[PDB]
Design a protein around this ligand. Structure first.
Ligand SMILES: CCCCCCCCCCCC(=O)O
Ligand SMILES: CCCCCCCCCCCC(=O)O
Lengths: 122, 122
């Protein structure tokens, strides 16, 4: 559902996922080692962790629909997976928005070999 | 289908898509303005162009199956989309392998705002 995750990011941050968040910091768009550089990076870390709770699902490819109710994302429930994938995506999109005031352009293309820490448990 | 694409990449280049190809140059992992930086980057532009030949499909989320006969990728044919999407991924994975020897670590995290050329037609 990378497509739906992208639509959420667009609506919430006003930024297009690529290139603003596809390789941001140590965790946005991938990465297991930190520490996270900032709040935005922590949002992505939390998203990776959320996807870890979906071993029975295919988060990157399972399509789903969502609505906006009073400015809030409302997840569908056609299947258990779609619901949980959607909630994970909803969380990250809102988190990215809330920390726009600290978005750092010098982290947009952060070289991943700068992320040295261990893989910290979620 | 990004899942299948990633598997092919690993099988062909011995590298996982992230971080080696997820944001390489002006076109790998996304991008429109060029010109492409090198052979590897041109592989990604051609891949993007290939996906543009599948407007009736969803190349990033449509799952498909494939085999490896005699070291070669053998795409399935259950649906036309699964077949055509698989041939695009097969093509880019093989191209990345063919150009492994000129992969440039300094383009792995290329800042996209450095790609200032026009958006050439495919
Ligand atoms: C790398 C392409 C994926 C683009 C999706 C937008 C980024 C969301 C960031 C969440 C980080 C994560 O769970 O990897
Ligand atoms: C950005 C997540 C995509 C990860 C897959 C590895 C990149 C494949 C390269 C093809 C470039 C393209 O069509 O964007």
């Amino acid at each position: 559902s990378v497509v739906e995750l992208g639509k959420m990011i667009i609506q919430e941050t006003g930024k297009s996922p690529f290139p603003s968040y596809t390789s941001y910091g140590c965790f946005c768009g991938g990465g297991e080692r930190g520490p996270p550089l900032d709040a935005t990076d922590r949002c992505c870390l939390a998203h990776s962790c959320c996807y870890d709770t979906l071993p029975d699902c295919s988060p990157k490819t399972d399509r789903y629909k969502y609505k906006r109710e009073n400015g809030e994302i409302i997840c569908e429930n056609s299947t258990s997976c779609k619901k949980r994938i959607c909630e994970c995506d909803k969380a990250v999109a809102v988190c990215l928005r809330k920390n726009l005031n600290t978005y750092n352009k010098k982290y947009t293309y952060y070289p991943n070999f700068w992320c040295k820490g261990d893989i910290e448990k979620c």
